[PDB]
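Example 4.3 (complexes with small molecules)
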Amino acid sequence: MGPSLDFALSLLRRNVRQVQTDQGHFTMLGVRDRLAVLPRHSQPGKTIWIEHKLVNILDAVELVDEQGVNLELTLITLDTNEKFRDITKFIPENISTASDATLVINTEHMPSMFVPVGDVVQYGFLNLSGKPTHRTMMYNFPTKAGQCGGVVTSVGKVIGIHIGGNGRQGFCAGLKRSYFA
Ligand SMILES: *[C@@H](O)[C@H](C[C@@H]1CCNC1=O)NC(=O)[C@H](Cc1ccccc1)NC(=O)OC(C)C
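Answer. The structure with GHY bound is encoded below.
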């Protein structure tokens, strides 16, 4: 195996999980310890179904910027026996673009799915489903419903979480390392 394939597959094995909430199927990224992140519109409750079992959520934090604007990420703390492989080192310190990125998706309906979204560019403001959203990036790929939560990766870096699209383009909430300090 080569390095990019090894890194994405290792992500899938160790950090990228199949989940279901009242809102349906999402991909969840486990970041470190018992901390994971999901798209805010997943609306996780007191418990979330992860892979094969119902897991209790100890805390949820919906991220907003200084202006009070939605970042579309929710940080959840899980009541789990053991800790996620810490991948904060692979998340850049500031929101970063990339070339030839891959979107990694893992849902019961779309298990271990790799989508070659291409170049990921700065986008900023986005209005999705009526909610105004900052710090997003864009890829020119017609991503689908069911792909939210999907992890945007390139060259050994984890840079975003898929949050929507418009039938021609896809968007992610950018990730920065300080969200997970
Ligand atoms: C995953 O949640 C889903 C994926 C979209 C559907 C088509 N392309 C995609 O990749 N995203 C959405 O459904 C969001 C919903 C959203 C976003 C932010 C805040 C609240 C809800 N987009 C969406 O519904 O698109 C509108 C143009 C209808």
